[PDB]
Amino acid sequence: SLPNVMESAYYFEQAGVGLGTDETYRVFLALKQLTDTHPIQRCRFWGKI
Amino acid sequence: SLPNVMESAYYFEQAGVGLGTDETYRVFLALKQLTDTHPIQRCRFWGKI
Amino acid sequence: MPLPQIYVEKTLALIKPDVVDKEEEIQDIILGSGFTIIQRRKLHLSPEHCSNFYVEQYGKMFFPNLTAYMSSGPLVAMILARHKAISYWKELMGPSNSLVAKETHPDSLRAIYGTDELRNALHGSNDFAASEREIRFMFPAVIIEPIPIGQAAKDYINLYVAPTLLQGLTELCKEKPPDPYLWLADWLMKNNPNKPKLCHF
Amino acid sequence: MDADSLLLSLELASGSGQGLSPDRRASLLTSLMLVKRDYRFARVLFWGRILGLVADYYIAQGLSEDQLAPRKTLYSLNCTEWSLLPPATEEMAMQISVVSGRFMGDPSHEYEHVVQIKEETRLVSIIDQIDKAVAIIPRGALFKTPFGVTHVNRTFEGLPLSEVRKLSSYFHFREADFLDSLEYDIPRGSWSIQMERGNALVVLRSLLWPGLTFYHAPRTKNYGYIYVGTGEKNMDLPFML
Amino acid sequence: MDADSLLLSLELASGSGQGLSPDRRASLLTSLMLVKRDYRFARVLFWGRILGLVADYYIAQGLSEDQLAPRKTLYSLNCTEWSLLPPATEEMAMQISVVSGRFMGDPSHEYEHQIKEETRLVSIIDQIDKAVAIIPRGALFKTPFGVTHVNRTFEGLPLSEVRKLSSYFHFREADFLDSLEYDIPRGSWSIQMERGNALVVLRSLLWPGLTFYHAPRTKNYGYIYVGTGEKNMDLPFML
């Protein structure tokens, strides 16, 4: 039930913004584990602090 | 007319294929010069040899 | 000792297995104070290796709990060089019995990183000969000053090695095998006074 | 960030998340090769980009063989054409004490003091302040000759993993061991040491001038730094510390 | 290539273009960290990829303290489960010469020309490592103890002797190794450069698919082979 994080991460980089590819893909894999753990309707990447 | 070859290049790296991000952007700039030089309807990246 | 030579003394710093996980902070303390790291060894002290290391204390005092304590985890051993390394290491380290050292020397290493007598924070060498024995037992083939020049080393060979060398060279003459390094090495590994005979199968 | 290793430096993967587009990246390789050509520099580092309000201020610095002189820094708007900035002094950097906030776009914007304050002089003096206060050097990269000429250490390894977390293993890249250590810092704790990808990366994020990012790995050869941020000094820092 | 070059995404920038995915980049980073953990290798390199028909082969190699030691190469299909390949002998090297055909996948596959698929993979790996593995000048220092260590004061190759071809060695048993100028046939290496003088690209032609990057001013080197898995003996017809 995830949104497509990867096209969003491709659109991140054109602004000079974001985690690149590897760190945001580990973020997306942790999002996949969180969505597989909990019954989540929408699990999108809010961002980083 | 230039096609969306940078998002196609992100599709290439998702498949693992490609010259890299900066080299595909460089090919996109060379295709922009090719489109601006000659009256071309469709100028897409056939590939490299 | 004289003018054109110098005396860079050495001491042993022992990191006990309760405090080996906190090694970076105490490493910051010992490097920032002035002590230098020569070589650090991460060694698992065997119960059958701790007794030969502690023939000076455990061989006359009955304390097997510390012997079991040194085998409970990893042990880090390091060589230190400093101007007045023994005195400054005793001043920074402080005295033992860390229950009393928490009240007498509150800035010492045993007051912070220690709990009791047997579960000590660290261990340091006291005398220079004890430091030489501790370094020679734990660490590999390194050179500890002074070099015993003159008649000191000749007596060491003539009462530790050269009887066995005389008995080896006596049998090496009769008969004469070609390339006698094989015969001398096999004689020393075979007719060893300090090592028993080995028979593989 | 060195010009010969811009693609060989993890910029977006450093954790700050203020990097470059492929447009800006290819523009920096071509344009920093150009300013290595026409300006006779020993080596050129990409200093960073100031975000601004209406346009981005891309900043790069070039260095001579003396390695401790004030830097002949350069600026660009479209990240392609670069020109030299005037050298900075204390009296000229004093002039913007009555103004604050972000700065936008073209260098011809006049600020009210009424003495008209140019955007360009505020930009280069602010570049001098960020160079003086933050953007540290690593230990062992700058060794000392008996003369005044300092060479970059070709044999630089130079930071063990036990000295990664320490403040004292970083010096300020500023002419003044060799340089002033990072334990001479006000306030105490104005640098964020952070462990990314295990031991394969460390970041010394400056909090007095955010978002400055210092770029490791250990066992390397990068030995880089980058400031992308809002541009003004974080005077709010001891309250949040 | 080490995991450091896996971080910079340098396979695509070499220009071979078969490349690697951020899927496999993150998978090789975590899984080669595991390979360095479980097996006590000094250095672990992602060797490359063998092109498949039903599954893709991913190959990495581990090295001991001696840099010229026989490597313990490993294979993985789903890029997490790394498993130790056996060492290769000459008896398995002349065994697989009667099998001519594409690498399929599913390592329990059997060839009727029996002959196992894993034996073909291991013998092909030893053939590529003995033929077209590449070490530049001054990258490896022959210690007088008898072992080979990485030269840690290796200044990168200057631009004068990049194109000789006498400045690249082999990563096997034999400036103490055999150079590239004695390779049979001559001219079997695609000498190339990237944008500027920032990277030197060497592509093997006895095995189409290995690429060697080298930055001429830093200590960055390594070979990745992603390609067909075949030795073309058609190469004299090509030149």
List the helices and strands and how they pair.
The structure is cut from a larger assembly and holds two copies of chain A (about 50 residues), one copy of chain C (about 200 residues) and two copies of chain D.
Chain A: H1 5-13, H2 22-37
Chain C: E1 10-15, H1 23-33, E2 36-43, H2 47-53, H3 64-70, E3 75-81, H4 85-93, H5 98-104, H6 109-113, E4 122-124, H7 128-138, H8 151-160, H9 162-173, H10 180-190
Antiparallel strand pairs in C: 1-3, 1-4, 2-3
Chain D: H1 22-38, E1 43-50, E2 57-63, E3 72-76, E4 83-84, H2 90-93, E5 110-112, E6 116-118, H3 119-133, E7 136-138, E8 142-143, E9 151-152, E10 170-172, E11 191-196, E12 201-206, E13 212-215, E14 224-229, H4 237-240
Parallel strand pairs in D: 1-14
Antiparallel strand pairs in D: 1-2, 2-3, 3-4, 5-6, 7-10, 8-9, 11-12, 13-14
PDB class: structural protein
Keywords: cilia, radial spoke
Entry title: RS head-neck monomer
Proportion of residues in extended strands of chain A: under 5%
* Sheet with the most strands, sense and barrel status of chain D: 6 strands, mixed
- Interface with most residues: D-E, 17 and 19 residues
Distance between the termini of chain A: 24 Å
User: Shape of chain A from CA axes?
Assistant: elongated
Structural class per helix/strand content of chain D?
A: alpha+beta
The CA-CA distance between the termini of chain D, in Å, is: 28 Å
Q: What is the helical fraction of chain A, as a range of percent? A: 40-55%
CA-based gyration radius of chain A: 11 Å
Oligomeric form of this entry? part of a larger assembly
Q: Strand order, biggest sheet of chain D?
A: 4-3-2-1-14-13
| Strand-residue proportion of chain D | 15-25%
Enzyme class (chain C): hydrolase
Region (NDK) (chain C): 9-141
Pfam families (chain C): Dpy-30, NDK
Subcellular location (chain C): Cell projection, Cilium; Cytoplasm, Cytoskeleton, Flagellum axoneme
What do you see in this structure?
The structure is cut from a larger assembly and holds two copies of chain A (49 residues), one copy of chain C (201 residues) and two copies of chain D. Chain A has 49 residues and is mainly alpha-helical. Chain A has helices at residues 5-13, 22-37. Chain A is elongated and about 35 Å long. Chain C is α+β, with helices and mostly antiparallel strands. Chain C has a four-stranded antiparallel beta sheet with strand order 2-3-1-4, sandwiched between helices. In chain C, helix 9 packs across helix 10 (180-190). The N and C termini of chain C lie far apart (53 Å). Chain D is an alpha+beta fold. Helix content of chain D is 17%, strand content 25%. Chain D contains four helices and 14 strands. The two termini of chain D are 28 Å apart.
